[model samples]
Target: MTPIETVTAFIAHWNSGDMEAMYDLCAEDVVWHNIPMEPIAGKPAMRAAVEGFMANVSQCDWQVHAIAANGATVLTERTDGFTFTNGRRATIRVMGTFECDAERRIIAWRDYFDMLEFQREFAG
Candidate 1:
């Protein structure tokens, strides 16, 4: 698979809320960085992080606004919709970068989003 295809599949798996499939797409030593937080390294940590996040979310969906790639990297622009258990709903625009190795397995991933906006949206 190409880098773009691999990244697309990763996002699809995530959107489907298939934790096992998402874990399968990641490299053994994957590094996942969500901006402003410490990076989560390795498959176990990655899986834990994802599971924890999903547990908090009542509903979640991703809309891909744009996608571009070259060689080993794919960049995607997306708007994520979420509804929290506390009756909060938000749509956050995020940009994700996926880096793949020769075998098209994702080795590194980074995400950027507006935390300030998120804070404001959820402000009580």
Candidate 2:
């Protein structure tokens, strides 16, 4: 699959709250970085991180504004809306970068967003 196809599949699972599907799209030695936190390495660790984050969210949909691929990498502009189980809600603007392996499994992902904006939106 193409880089855009891989990332599109990832976001689809992400929006649906399908952790296993999302995990299945990742490489075993993946690296993911959410700018507010440190980098997470390896599949198990990445799964743990995603699961923990999703646990706090009752609803979420990552809406893509724009997307493009450059070789094996994909960059996207998005607004990710979320309603946490704790009643904290927000639609955070985001920029994301992704890289996938030959099999279309994501090997790396990085996200950028404003920390203060994220905090302000969450009333939790």
Candidate 3:
């Protein structure tokens, strides 16, 4: 897979809640961060986090507004909307940066978003 494909797959997998496929697209020592939180070290750690995040989320949509890629890096502007099982909905604007390893597997990923804004979304 190319860098763009890998990055696209990463986001698609997440939006579809296919955690296994999402993890398969990552390198063994992948690093991930959702701004303001300590970086997650590896695939296992990230999967644990993913499960927790989705435990209360019935559905989450990743609506990509723009995407750009160069060599092994990809950037995206998107809104991640979540609908919780409890009937709460939140649409959070987000910017994501990702890097692919030589095998075109995602090795590093970071998402920038306002935590305060996110909290408010839940209150609505």
Who wins the TM-score comparison?
Answer: 3
Worst 10 residues of 1 by lDDT: 115-124
Scored by lDDT, model 2 comes in at 0.87
**Tens-digit lDDT track for model 3 on 1-124?**
7888787887788788887888998898999998878899998898798887777788878898999998889999998999899887779999999998778888999999998887787553
Candidate 1 wrong stretches, greater than 4 Å: 86-88, 120-124
Best lDDT among the predictions, by candidate number: 2
TM-score of each: 0.88, 0.90, 0.92
- On TM-score, the stronger of 2 and 3 is 3
In the range 28-122, model 1's lDDT, one tens digit per residue, is 99999988678999999997887776675777678888999988999999998887788677888889899999998899999998778666655
Worst 10 residues of 2 by lDDT: 115-124
What is each predicted model's overall lDDT from 0 to 1? 0.84, 0.87, 0.86
Question: Which residue pairs in candidate 1 collide?
Answer: none
Error of 2 at 68 (Å): 0.1
**Please, what are the lDDT tens digits per residue for candidate 2 over residues 34-91?**
8898999999898787777777788787899999999888999999999888776679
> Each model's number of backbone clashes?
0, 0, 0
